[PDB]
Structures are given as C-alpha cells and as structure tokens.
Amino acid sequence: YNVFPRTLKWSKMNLTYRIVNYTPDMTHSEVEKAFKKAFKVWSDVTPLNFTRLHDGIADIMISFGIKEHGDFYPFDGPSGLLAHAFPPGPNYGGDAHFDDDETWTSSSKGYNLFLVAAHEFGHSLGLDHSKDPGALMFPIYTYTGFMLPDDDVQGIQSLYGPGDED
Amino acid sequence: YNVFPRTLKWSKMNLTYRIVNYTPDMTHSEVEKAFKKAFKVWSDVTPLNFTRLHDGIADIMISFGIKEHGDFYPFDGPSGLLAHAFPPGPNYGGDAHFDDDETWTSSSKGYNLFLVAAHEFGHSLGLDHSKDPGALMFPIYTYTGKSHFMLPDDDVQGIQSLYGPG
Amino acid sequence: YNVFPRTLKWSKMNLTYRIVNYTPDMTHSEVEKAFKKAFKVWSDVTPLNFTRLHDGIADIMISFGIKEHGDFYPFDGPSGLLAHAFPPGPNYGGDAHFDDDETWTSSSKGYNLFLVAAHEFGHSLGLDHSKDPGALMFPIYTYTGFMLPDDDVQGIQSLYGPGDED
Amino acid sequence: YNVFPRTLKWSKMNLTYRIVNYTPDMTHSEVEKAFKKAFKVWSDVTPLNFTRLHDGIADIMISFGIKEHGDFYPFDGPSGLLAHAFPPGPNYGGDAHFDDDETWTSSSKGYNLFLVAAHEFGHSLGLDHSKDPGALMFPIYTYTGKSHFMLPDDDVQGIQSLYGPG
Numbered sequence: 001y002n003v004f005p006r007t008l009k010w011s012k013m014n015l016t017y018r019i020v021n022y023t024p025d026m027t028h029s030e031v032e033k034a035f036k037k038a039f040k041v042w043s044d045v046t047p048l049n050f051t052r053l054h055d056g057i058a059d060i061m062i063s064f065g066i067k068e069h070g071d072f073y074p075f076d077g078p079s080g081l082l083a084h085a086f087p088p089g090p091n092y093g094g095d096a097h098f099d100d101d102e103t104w105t106s107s108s109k110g111y112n113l114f115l116v117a118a119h120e121f122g123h124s125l126g127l128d129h130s131k132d133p134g135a136l137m138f139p140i141y142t143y144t145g146f147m148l149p150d151d152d153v154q155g156i157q158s159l160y161g162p163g164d165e166d
Numbered sequence: 167y168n169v170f171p172r173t174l175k176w177s178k179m180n181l182t183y184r185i186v187n188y189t190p191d192m193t194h195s196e197v198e199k200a201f202k203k204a205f206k207v208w209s210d211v212t213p214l215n216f217t218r219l220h221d222g223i224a225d226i227m228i229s230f231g232i233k234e235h236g237d238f239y240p241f242d243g244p245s246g247l248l249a250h251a252f253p254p255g256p257n258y259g260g261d262a263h264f265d266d267d268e269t270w271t272s273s274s275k276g277y278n279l280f281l282v283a284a285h286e287f288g289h290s291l292g293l294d295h296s297k298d299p300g301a302l303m304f305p306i307y308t309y310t311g312k313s314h315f316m317l318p319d320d321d322v323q324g325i326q327s328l329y330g331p332g
Numbered sequence: 333y334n335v336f337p338r339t340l341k342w343s344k345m346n347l348t349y350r351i352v353n354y355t356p357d358m359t360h361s362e363v364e365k366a367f368k369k370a371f372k373v374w375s376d377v378t379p380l381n382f383t384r385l386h387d388g389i390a391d392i393m394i395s396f397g398i399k400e401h402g403d404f405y406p407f408d409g410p411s412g413l414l415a416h417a418f419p420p421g422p423n424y425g426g427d428a429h430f431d432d433d434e435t436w437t438s439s440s441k442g443y444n445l446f447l448v449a450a451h452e453f454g455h456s457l458g459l460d461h462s463k464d465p466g467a468l469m470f471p472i473y474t475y476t477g478f479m480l481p482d483d484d485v486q487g488i489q490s491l492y493g494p495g496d497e498d
Numbered sequence: 499y500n501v502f503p504r505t506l507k508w509s510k511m512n513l514t515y516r517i518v519n520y521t522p523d524m525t526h527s528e529v530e531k532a533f534k535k536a537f538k539v540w541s542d543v544t545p546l547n548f549t550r551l552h553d554g555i556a557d558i559m560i561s562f563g564i565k566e567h568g569d570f571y572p573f574d575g576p577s578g579l580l581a582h583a584f585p586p587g588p589n590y591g592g593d594a595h596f597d598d599d600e601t602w603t604s605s606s607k608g609y610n611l612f613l614v615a616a617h618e619f620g621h622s623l624g625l626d627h628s629k630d631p632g633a634l635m636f637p638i639y640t641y642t643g644k645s646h647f648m649l650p651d652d653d654v655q656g657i658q659s660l661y662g663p664g
C-alpha cells in the first residue's frame with residue numbers, strides 16, 4: 001500500500017517545462033534565458049533537473065496571458081496581480097502563468113522576468129510564501145542586480161534534499 | 167519558509183457525505199446502495215463512520231459530471247479517466263467525481279460503481295495507489311464476477327496504518 | 333459567400349438534447365417527463381423538433397450541479413440563482429444548467445422543473461428575458477398549475493417561424 | 499420579448515488590434531508581418547483600416563493559447579481545431595485565438611499563419627464560411643506554394659456586401 005506524501009512535492013527529480021507562448025516584451029532568446037536561469041536557482045541546491053520541451057505536455061507549462069486565461073485566477077490588467085503558479089500535482093499543477101498586461105524585462109525596469117519566474121517556480125516546486133522579508137518567496141517584488149537566500153534554500157531542501165552539496 | 171502541507175488523515179472519525187447528483191445509468195436506490203457499500207468497505211475495518219446528508223456541505227461531496235465540471239481536471243469522454251477524488255482536507259478535500267461518459271452499473275455491463283467508488287473513497291481517506299495488483303487501490307479495473315467483495319489485506323493494512331483497526 | 337445570421341439561433345430544425353445527470357429530488361422518469369413537456373412548449377409553435385440522446389454530444393446538454401460546475405456562472409447554494417442556459421451556438425451554446433441546491437419538483441412546492449426548464453429552453457433557443465410580466469421569459473418565477481403566453485410565441489416565431497399552424 | 503441580436507458589421511471603419519502574445523514557432527517580426535498582411539487582405543478591398551495597439555484594449559484582441567484558454571471553447575492539441583474568432587461586437591467580439599499546439603509558419607512547414615489569420619479576420623469582420631471551395635472563407639486549409647496571395651472574388655463580394663468597396 002501507499003499513503004499520500006506529507007507535502008505537495010514532485011515525486012520525481014527529472015522535471016520538464018514548456019514555454020507555451022511568449023511575451024511581446026522580450027525576444028524569445030531573452031525569455032528562454034530568464035526561465036533557464038530561474039530553474040537553475042533551484043536545481044543548484046536540490047537534486048532536481050529541468051529539461052525544456054518544445055511541444056506536448058510538460059510538468060511545468062509556462063504561459064503569458066491576460067484577464068481570463070483558463071483557470072480560476074483571472075489576471076487584472078496592468079499592475080496588481082503579476083503572475084501565479086500552481087503547486088506540484090497533475091494537470092495544471094506546477095504550471096506558471098504571467099500577466100502580459102505587465103511589462104516583462106531583462107532589466108531593472110518593469111518586472112524582471114528572471115526574478116519573478118524564480119519566485120513562481122518556487123511555487124511550482126512546492127513553496128508557499130515566506131515571512132522572511134529577505135526571501136525570494138517573500139511576496140513583495142524588489143529588483144536585485146543572484147544568490148538564493150537561505151530561507152528559500154532551507155525550504156526547498158526540506159522537500160527535495162540538497163542534491164550534490166558541492 | 168512555508169510549504170504546502172497535506173492532511174494525512176481526517177482528524178475526526180465521524181464523516182459525512184452527500185450525493186449531489188445522480189447518473190442516468192442506475193436508479194437512485196442503486197446508486198445509494200453502491201455508495202453505502204463502498205463506505206462500509208472502509209468503516210468495517212477502522213473506527214470511521216459515515217453519515218449521509220441530503221443538503222448543505224458534507225465532508226465527502228460526491229458528484230457525476232463530464233468533460234470540464236468545475237475543478238479544471240476535466241474528464242475525457244468514454245473510457246480513459248473514470249473518476250477522481252481529492253485527499254483529506256477542507257473544501258474539495260475528500261470529494262469524489264465520477265465521469266458520466268462512462269456507463270456505471272450495479273453489475274458488470276460497464277464499470278461497477280460500488281467497486282470504483284470504494285477505490286475512490288480510499289483516496290478520500292488518505293490512500294494513494296497500491297503496487298499490489300490484487301489491491302482495491304491498484305489502479306487497473308478488474309471485475310471478479312462474484313456477488314461478494316472482500317477488502318484485500320493490502321488495503322486493510324493501508325487504511326489501518328492511518329486510522330487503526332475498528 | 334455567407335455573412336452571419338442576424339440573431340443567435342439554431343440553423344437547423346432537428347435539435348438534440350441529453351440529460352447528462354439527474355437531481356436527487358425527483359425520479360428519472362419525472363425529470364424526463366418534465367423536460368419532454370418543456371421542449372414540447374416550443375416545438376408546438378415552431379418547426380423545431382427535439383430528440384433525446386442518451387450519450388454523446390447533443391445540441392442541448394442538460395445538467396444538475398452546484399457551485400462551480402465548469403463555466404463562468406457558478407451557482408450559489410440554496411435560493412438566489414436557480415438555473416441558466418446559453419444561447420444557440422457551438423459547445424456550451426444551448427446548454428442548460430440547474431442548481432441542485434434548489435429543490436426541484438413536479439408540484440407547486442419548491443421550483444417546478446417543467447416550468448423552469450421551459451424558460452431555460454427559451455434561452456437555449458435564442459430568447460432573452462421579456463418585459464411582459466405575463467411571459468414565460470419574464471425572469472420572476474410564479475407557479476402555474478400550461479399555455480405558452482403570446483409574447484413568447486411571438487418571440488420564438490420571430491426566430492424560427494410558426495411551423496404547422498394547426 | 500427580446501432575442502439575442504448579432505452585430506452584423508463594425509459600425510466604424512477604423513479598427514484596432516493587439517497582439518497579446520506570441521507563438522514559439524515564429525519570430526516576433528514574422529508574426530507581426532503575417533497579421534499585418536492578413537488585415538491588409540480585407541482593408542485593401544473595403545473602407546476598413548487597421549491600427550495596432552501595444553497596450554490596453556483593442557477591438558480585435560489576438561492571442562495564442564492551448565487547450566482551455568479562457569473562453570470555454572478549448573483547443574484540442576495538434577491538428578483538429580486550428581483557430582477561432584468571434585464575430586463583430588464588444589468585448590470578445592472580433593477577437594481571434596490560435597491553437598499553439600499547431601505549428602505556425604511563414605511558409606509551408608505547418609499551417610501558414612498569414613493564411614489562417616486572414617480567414618479568422620474574415621470572421622472578425624462578419625463573414626461566415628463560404629461554400630465556394632476556392633474561397634479564403636472555405637473551411638478547409640490548402641496552400642498554393644505561391645509567394646503571392648490574391649483574395650478570391652467570393653470573399654471580395656462577401657466583405658464588400660457588408661462594408662462596400664474601398
């Protein structure tokens with residue numbers, strides 16, 4: 001027999017993601033680089049591995065949308081809600097949605113896609129928000145021009161372990 | 167930091183259920199009998215007890231539906247997905263949904279509602295799938311042809327690991 | 333070439349319906365009789381014909397549900413919203429949903445399924461609400477213990493014609 | 499009584515569009531060029547003009563999406579449904595959605611975005627499907643292999659029946 005796990009977490013270390021569509025705001029290459037770096041934040045401190053799929057169903061489906069986009073969490077135009085992601089699970093579990101009524105960037109202007117995506121993928125992997133104001137998972141955006149804070153390291157390792165500590 | 171903790175078991179032994187709607191495929195009394203027997207599989211071997219409510223909110227809300235039916239885990243027409251249930255917890259926790267594009271039966275012409283529901287309620291109570299091919303919680307449907315059902319030992323051990331014996 | 337029609341209406345006279353699931357409140361036969369009579373209200377004054385399908389995709393998919401049930405119009409528990417239906421069109425177009433937190437009846441008590449369904453199927457066929465307080469499509473429920481009012485006759489015939497006037 | 503009247507044409511000749519997001523399959527500039535050319539098919543033969551907006555609400559909102567994407571007209575994975583568009587009117591009226599489980603191309607390897615979009619925008623402007631197999635508005639996709647596209651006479655006549663000649 002099997003009882004359920006104690007937390008929402010992926011039961012496998014090899015996870016896939018797919019960039020379903022792209023923002024007008026950045027080139028395809030810049031978006032890809034941002035998401036690759038954002039996953040690396042987490043793979044650098046766990047045994048997780050992330051691979052990109054170009055098509056089909058990936059664990060973590062990433063998309064840009066506005067207003068109603070296929071779930072119970074419609075976006076709200078400029079400002080306000082920026083992005084959301086579902087905890088580990090089937091179907092929409094893991095998926096990350098970005099509000100394209102925001103301006104996404106690879107700079108200090110607008111919202112830096114890398115930084116916001118790194119937070120979103122924390123949710124995709126099983127972290128909720130933190131009360132540590134220095135944490136990546138603290139739900140207030142501050143631009144930094146990157147080292148994963150220790151609160152986030154401790155949280156993600158509580159779920160997956162550290163992987164190679166080197 | 168925070169994770170998304172799972173409720174590993176119901177913290178009360180007296181649970182309620184409600185049959186929100188009914189399949190075209192069986193009479194009301196047939197459906198009621200199937201679900202009553204499916205709960206009894208589990209209450210017979212633990213301290214759990216189940217009470218039916220006719221109105222309002224119950225711990226285990228049971229419904230029949232097709233395609234997209236309110237949780238963004240859509241069903242898929244005949245065959246494939248049969249049913250799904252949520253693990254213990256508030257709101258959708260415990261609830262069980264049956265794909266009415268299947269043919270539900272009190273016998274063998276289609277999927278036996280009692281047997282499928284008994285498996286679903288295992289999930290509602292905290293059991294994941296078993297790897298024992300003879301277990302109720304094994305995720306391949308078979309039918310013995312016999313008028314009596316005996317809960318396999320693997321399932322007895324699993325549910326008693328959570329709730330103890332009756 | 334073809335431009336679109338001037339109103340939302342079915343472009344065919346042979347329409348199908350499917351009772352996807354059933355209320356706890358009434359027997360299957362009573363529900364079927366109510367819906368058959370409710371369609372007859374409209375077929376008696378137009379060239380429309382209604383046939384019931386037991387499975388598969390019908391034009392008018394009828395279901396009973398509560399709270400979130402797969403669209404943008406969640407139900408609201410007892411009282412308040414009773415039912416809604418979509419105007420003619422593909423997919424959910426035509427479909428009729430009944431809130432099973434109401435008590436549906438074949439009497440003067442609760443909400444008479446026949447009477448409410450007859451109004452809902454007016455929507456399914458292309459009528460919005462009327463300002464004639466005597467109309468079936470007036471959106472306030474009154475029990476009657478049936479003759480389709482003339483405002484509704486005029487409205488439905490404006491879309492489909494009268495069929496056989498005998 | 500009231501029916502659900504359709505808007506048979508836009509009542510202004512100056513329309514706006516917005517490309518809300520972008521397919522992985524083509525560069526931003528390729529997508530922009532395809533949509534610009536698709537609008538020009540129609541503006542070249544009528545008094546219509548089209549202006550691109552980068553932010554906010556536009557008459558014709560264009561997006562790429564997969565599966566359930568916010569309107570309960572879900573896409574279906576590769577092949578089958580390609581795209582859909584809403585007829586003239588407020589809110590979703592005019593908007594066009596492209597299934598990104600298709601491969602969109604500037605050429606012939608997949609579905610040519612320009613050609614499919616030109617058909618979609620015919621719907622956005624008030625045209626239904628043609629029965630002429632040589633029409634742009636005929637709902638079977640073919641590709642000529644030629645570098646130039648000429649709007650067929652059937653489509654010219656259809657769109658000019660609504661808006662007149664340019």
Ligand SMILES: CC(C)CCN([C@@H](C(=O)NO)C(C)C)S(=O)(=O)c1ccc2ccccc2c1
Pocket residue numbers: 080081082083084085115116117119120123136138139140141142
């Ligand atoms: C008031 C708070 C709870 C609302 C948070 N927002 C949402 C959030 O935490 N998304 O992950 C929440 C409504 C689910 S947010 O859209 O403002 C947001 C999104 C991504 C972020 C990434 C880094 C830093 C802050 C962020 C804030």
Ligand SMILES: CC(C)CCN([C@@H](C(=O)NO)C(C)C)S(=O)(=O)c1ccc2ccccc2c1
Pocket residue numbers: 246247248249250251281282283285286289302304305306307308
């Ligand atoms: C590929 C497998 C894991 C998919 C299982 N299926 C679902 C399930 O285990 N539901 O409890 C799974 C997608 C969550 S199933 O719908 O095929 C199903 C449902 C009830 C069953 C009851 C008894 C026996 C088999 C069953 C199979």
Ligand SMILES: CC(C)CCN([C@@H](C(=O)NO)C(C)C)S(=O)(=O)c1ccc2ccccc2c1
Pocket residue numbers: 412413414415416417447448449451452455468470471472473474
């Ligand atoms: C305040 C009004 C507009 C809300 C109407 N209601 C809804 C309606 O007209 N459904 O057809 C409306 C929210 C779309 S209702 O649920 O109260 C309702 C439903 C069926 C009915 C059938 C016969 C008579 C009245 C009815 C009222």
Ligand SMILES: CC(C)CCN([C@@H](C(=O)NO)C(C)C)S(=O)(=O)c1ccc2ccccc2c1
Pocket residue numbers: 578579580581582583613614615617618621634636637638639640
């Ligand atoms: C069975 C048919 C009516 C389904 C049409 N399809 C849809 C359509 O006509 N969209 O404009 C229909 C379901 C609303 S389609 O997705 O196969 C499609 C879409 C764009 C097209 C553009 C050019 C040529 C063909 C096309 C076919």
Ligand SMILES: [Ca+2]
Pocket residue numbers: 043044045046047048162163164
């Ligand atoms: Ca690692």
Ligand SMILES: [Ca+2]
Pocket residue numbers: 075076077078079080081082099101102
């Ligand atoms: Ca926003």
Ligand SMILES: [Ca+2]
Pocket residue numbers: 058059060061089090091092093094095
């Ligand atoms: Ca997912």
Ligand SMILES: [Ca+2]
Pocket residue numbers: 023024025099100101102103104
């Ligand atoms: Ca943007």
Ligand SMILES: [Ca+2]
Pocket residue numbers: 241242243244245246247248265267268
């Ligand atoms: Ca199924």
Ligand SMILES: [Ca+2]
Pocket residue numbers: 224225226227255256257258259260261
């Ligand atoms: Ca529940």
Ligand SMILES: [Ca+2]
Pocket residue numbers: 189190191265266267268269270
């Ligand atoms: Ca069925």
Ligand SMILES: [Ca+2]
Pocket residue numbers: 375376377378379380494495496
């Ligand atoms: Ca008739």
Ligand SMILES: [Ca+2]
Pocket residue numbers: 407408409410411412413414431433434
């Ligand atoms: Ca209600």
Ligand SMILES: [Ca+2]
Pocket residue numbers: 390391392393421422423424425426427
């Ligand atoms: Ca329908």
Ligand SMILES: [Ca+2]
Pocket residue numbers: 355356357431432433434435436
């Ligand atoms: Ca009821």
Ligand SMILES: [Ca+2]
Pocket residue numbers: 573574575576577578579580597599600
């Ligand atoms: Ca498709």
